[PDB]
Amino acid sequence: RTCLISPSSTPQTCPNGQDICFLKAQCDKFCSIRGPVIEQGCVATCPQFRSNYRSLLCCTTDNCNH
Amino acid sequence: RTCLISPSSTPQTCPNGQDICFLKAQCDKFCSIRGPVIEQGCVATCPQFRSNYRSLLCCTTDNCNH
């Protein structure tokens, strides 16, 4: 499908297998002052939820990861 | 924490030990007369991604499940 991409959050077209879009907010040792580290794009699966995240969003819809 | 709750989406403090809130949405047959079934609450572990799901948001912050 198509999903949004990180930095700029624009559209990009997945390859076969990347049927799912995601938005992932994760925390470094400096989550509290910097903020979480965001990363969106095309995944093939929904990444299992690491304790360090402020949140995961996994959606099958184009550009749904926003 | 206090997470948003399904039928009505009023905040409710997770039973001590449940810190992550989630928002789920899948379609059923009336997925065109109403839209997807939306279920939101408190959990222990973020739910397993499930193919037949329109979306699944797992966040750890108050009433974020929205």
From Swiss-Prot, chains A, B:
Q: Does the UniProt entry include the keyword Secreted?
A: yes
Q: In which tissues is it expressed?
A: Expressed by the venom gland.
Stated consequence of mutating residue 34 to A = Loss of inhibition of neuronal and muscle receptors
One Gene Ontology cellular component term attached to this UniProt record is: extracellular region
One GO MF term: ion channel regulator activity
Look up the domain of life of the source. Answer: Eukaryota
The UniProt entry lists the main location of this chain as: secreted
Q: Which UniProt keywords apply?
A: Acetylcholine receptor inhibiting toxin, Disulfide bond, Ion channel impairing toxin, Neurotoxin, Postsynaptic neurotoxin, Secreted, Signal, Toxin
| Entry's localization field | Secreted
Q: List the disulfide bonds.
A: 3-21, 14-42, 27-31, 46-58, 59-64
Quaternary state and partners of this protein?
Homodimer and heterodimer; non-covalently linked.
Role of this protein: Postsynaptic neurotoxin that binds and inhibits neuronal nicotinic acetylcholine receptors (nAChR) with high affinity (IC(50)<100 nM). Is a selective, and slowly reversible antagonist of alpha-3/CHRNA3-containing and some alpha-4/CHRNA4-containing AChRs.
Q: What else is known?
A: Shows very low activity towards muscle nicotinic acetylcholine receptors (IC=~10 uM).
The family classification in the record reads:
Belongs to the three-finger toxin family. Long-chain subfamily. Kappa-neurotoxin sub-subfamily.
Q: What is this protein called?
A: Kappa-bungarotoxin
- Organism in which the protein naturally occurs: Bungarus multicinctus (Many-banded krait)
